[PDB]
Write a protein that binds this ligand. Structure first.
Ligand SMILES: Nc1ncnc2c1ncn2[C@@H]1O[C@H](COP(=O)(O)OP(=O)(O)O)[C@@H](O)[C@H]1O
Ligand SMILES: Nc1ncnc2c1ncn2[C@@H]1O[C@H](COP(=O)(O)OP(=O)(O)O)[C@@H](O)[C@H]1O
Ligand code: ALF
Ligand code: ALF
Ligand SMILES: [Mg+2]
Ligand SMILES: [Mg+2]
Lengths: 132, 448, 448
DNA sequence: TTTTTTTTTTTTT
């Protein structure tokens, strides 16, 4: 669901794709079908100063262009500056998956064979960032 | 099966954004209500959020879930898992206003569809109701939906513009050099001075005991307005047929005895005056009369709108009189019926922005007091009438209750209520021979 | 197996917030105790947190885990995993106060359930205890619950306080009799003295018969508050359009004949006064008006929240008037609708912590009494308005009901109900020419 | 569940 919103926002306003913080190091296996989003972000970053049609026509060789076109119309709003905050919030939510992974693995290791002082300390440090 | 139009995505987005930002609740609050949500779980969720926010509590996943569980409604809304899904699916509350507007659109469309279906069902099965009843029902149903959308305007937005507009309007009124009367001239110097005429949008109630000439004074004001303006004037003579009202009007205008006109014992000069009055009226054609009895506010409003559209507005409206009007929906409680009638007439006056003189009658307690001069307390079915009444004038005649009165031929118009002006007594000459009121030209009595 | 009422989520949120924000321990310390946590591990964790705070150590995951392990109770709670989960599952510690309040609610409800269980057990087995003994046991058990109610003072002040007040006043007669204004200034010396200004969070109901200057008095109060404060004030003029209200305000401020203002018969000096008033008002921009018709309480609340958030609070709210407000849900019973409106407005005043002058109207029965001075029961639907109202002020004018009255130009503001102050009459000079009230400078009449 | 109306019988001024 969130992936559909992210893709729709990315396709609707290709200009904002230049403001995306780097996410190349992140694995695409965490979120479902995240490879399409990362590929779209990299492609849109490669050509700053573009229109929505020229971004849409890029993936005409593949069969996933229909999804991009159907998502672009969806969640369409006239105001431009309003969408930047929503996109930023979605990006922050997506980036929070890394902290989610890190705390989940630490909790799993705690349940498997416990944790030492430093391990629970780093778990606490990671968890403090989740609330804020 | 034609599914009702709806947008689950907009509702979910609003629900999630409210959990993410309580501050924008106001933006959601003035745009959407609980009943708007197509899905009942969303209705319950919105109700619980409103209850919590009204208490000052923060609208969040945990507090909302526990609040629903306190009423056993959590599992009815999909549970904590569904609430977490709603919280997650919303990225941010920036576009929450658009989502609320979309939800409002869908809800109003479903309401329109429901009203249309009900009207169609009634048409298929009138259950003995005449066509007029069904058409009036459809009128009311459509008008309700039309009025239910008046939520974007009429609010206390940034005052500066409102103050500037009001001051500009005041300056415009000042610049227009009127002769003291800024509204419909009443035809009487003292009454116009104290009232500045019958103002637009204002509800005026003229009252007195029966036989006091209340209808006489009303018709005199109507004639003055018609002669002093070209805009039409509308009369609802529920009390009397149009024939007697027109006979009174001719007697007053011609200053000929009403008895002779009623009896037809008219001489050549009297008939000449009558013919001149008829010619003047036929030249004006700014008067419309309805003698239909039992007229409800709905029919009065519809006919007023018809006349205004056909003639570009109405200068004045006249109703004879309030207590005769019918509201079957409130027939059980007479007081509630009268309050509804008065409020509807006030609303109609504001909408058409025209003076509306609706006549009224007093309780008998007045005549049980030592002083028989009417006051505000004396109105019958009284409480709501005075509240909706913007101007209140009572008609008194000491000669009526005192044969040896020195005020024979004199009538007291007591302005008892005036929002933007002084209250007090005025005197007029009453020619019951002609059923007319005239400016008082005797010695001026100082009002103590 | 009816589980005792509880909230795992609330306790987990409170514990996680304490792990996250130690500064909010005090806000939690007053609300809840260790016993209030339904689950024993949460009781242990809160006890350890209290012990650490008392010793001054910070409350975090590492310190709490170390302290619990040192006591051997770490296993009883779940270790680093469970405490990390407690810290994790809390959306934010900013709402820890609400979670603590909910936990206190659950604890009080569980205490009540336990009390009921004990009373039922005693009833099943009196053990020779008389019915009086069982009743006294139940009453003693219940009185523990009602410790958070109290009764405060009811009026009886002892001889020592009387002597102290008498000495203070006898000494200050030589000195300056200051008022002690703390609330929003009413603009009048006597009214401020008796009320100490419009108290925030307190509901004030100004009532009067129509035409008594109710709206006039409210507008004068609002204007005085605006000129004596910088916080914005708010008005809901359902009864009248904004234009008439603004004209009244300008006429009062400029002390010019409002009739001239309405008619546009304004001279150069009056025009200069009007221009100065306009300049002052456009300089302030601390007054907001809504000319909406048929506002529901929710709409008023939302709009007030909007204005307060935009301008950081509201100095004063005014509603004209209660009987105009609409509640479609309770339209069936008028009294219930009025009661709910009053309750919602009182809750709004408490939440916004602002004085709220909501106007009300009286039943005609008042004028049936020999003395027409209003009293509390004279309110229409007095059942709920009187209960909710914290301050009740009635406007009376003997000149209105007696033209030969010796109090001409004098209006009586009678504080008939005041929770935190004395009831009694106050006099003001009413200039109907300007539609204004002024401090009464005439001879003081003994309040008998 | 309430506001009206308006009888009737009393008191009080
Ligand atoms: N020929 C006449 N001479 C004197 N007075 C008359 C004559 N005809 C009608 N009137 C007066 O006109 C009044 C009109 O009465 P009516 O319309 O019933 O009063 P309202 O409209 O206030 O109920 C009567 O009270 C009567 O005194
Ligand atoms: N030009 C004037 N001269 C004297 N008094 C006036 C003037 N204009 C208005 N008033 C007084 O102002 C009062 C306002 O009436 P209104 O606002 O209807 O009363 P309320 O608001 O108490 O229901 C009236 O009772 C009237 O006596
Ligand atoms: F008797 Al009428 F108006 F004529 F009340
Ligand atoms: F008649 Al009003 F407020 F003016 F009750
Ligand atoms: Mg008549
Ligand atoms: Mg008023």
């Amino acid at each position: 669901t969130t992936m559909r919103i992210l893709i729709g926002l990315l396709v609707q306003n290709p200009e904002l794709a230049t403001l995306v913080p780097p996410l190349e190091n992140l694995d695409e296996n965490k979120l479902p079908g995240l490879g399409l989003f990362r590929e779209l972000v990299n492609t849109c970053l490669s050509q700053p100063g573009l229109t929505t049609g020229q971004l849409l026509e890029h993936y005409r060789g593949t069969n996933n262009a229909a999804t991009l076109e159907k998502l672009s119309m969806w969640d369409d709003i006239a105001d431009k500056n309003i969408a930047e905050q929503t996109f930023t919030d979605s990006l922050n939510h997506m980036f929070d998956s890394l902290l989610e992974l890190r705390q989940e693995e630490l909790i799993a290791r705690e349940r498997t064979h416990g944790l030492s002082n430093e391990e629970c300390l780093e778990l606490w440090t990671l968890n403090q960032e989740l609330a804020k | 099966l034609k599914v009702p139009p709806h947008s689950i995505e907009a509702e979910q987005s609003v629900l999630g954004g409210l959990m993410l930002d309580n501050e924008r609740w106001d933006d959601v609050a003035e745009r959407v209500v609980a009943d708007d949500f197509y899905t009942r779980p969303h209705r319950h969720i919105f109700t619980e959020m409103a209850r919590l926010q009204e208490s000052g509590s923060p609208i969040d996943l945990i507090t909302l879930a526990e609040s629903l569980e306190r009423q056993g409604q959590l599992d009815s809304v999909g549970g904590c898992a569904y609430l977490a899904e709603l919280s997650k699916n919303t990225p941010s509350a920036a576009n929450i206003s658009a989502y609320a507007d979309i939800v409002r659109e869908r809800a109003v469309v479903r309401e329109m569809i429901s009203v249309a279906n009900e009207i169609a069902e009634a048409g298929f099965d009138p259950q003995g109701r005449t066509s007029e009843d069904l058409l009036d029902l459809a009128e009311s149903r459509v008008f309700k939906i039309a009025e239910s959308r008046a939520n974007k305007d009429e609010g206390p937005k940034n005052i500066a513009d409102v103050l500037d507009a009001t001051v500009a309007r005041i300056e415009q009124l000042f610049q227009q050099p009127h002769d003291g009367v800024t509204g419909v001239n009443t035809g009487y110097d003292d009454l116009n001075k104290k009232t500045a005429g019958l103002q637009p949008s204002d509800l005026i109630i003229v009252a007195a005991r029966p036989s006091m000439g209340k209808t006489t004074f009303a018709m005199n004001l109507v004639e003055n307005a018609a002669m002093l303006q070209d805009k039409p004037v509308l009369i609802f003579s529920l009390e009397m047929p149009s024939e007697q009202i027109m006979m009174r009007s001719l007697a007053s205008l011609s200053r000929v005895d009403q008895t002779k006109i009623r009896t037809g014992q008219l001489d050549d000069e009297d008939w000449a005056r009558i013919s001149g009055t008829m010619g003047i009226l036929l030249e004006k054609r700014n008067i419309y009369i309805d003698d239909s009895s039992g007229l409800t506010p709905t029919e009065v409003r519809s006919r007023a709108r018809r006349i205004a559209r056909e003639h570009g507005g109405i200068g004045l409206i006249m109703i004879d009189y309030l207590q005769l009007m019918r509201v079957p929906a409130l027939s059980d409680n007479r007081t509630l019926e009268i309050a509804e009638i008065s409020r509807s007439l006030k609303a109609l006056a504001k909408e058409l922005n025209v003076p509306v003189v609706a006549l009224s009658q007093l309780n008998r307690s007045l005549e049980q007091r030592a002083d028989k001069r009417p006051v505000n307390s004396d109105l019958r079915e009284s409480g709501s009438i005075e509240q909706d009444a913007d101007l209140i004038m009572f008609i008194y005649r000491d000669e009526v209750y005192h044969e040896n009165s020195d005020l024979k031929g004199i009538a007291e118009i007591i302005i008892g209520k005036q929002r933007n002006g002084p209250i007090g007594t005025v005197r007029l000459t009453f020619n019951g021979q002609w059923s007319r009121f005239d400016n008082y030209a005797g010695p001026q009595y100082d009002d103590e």
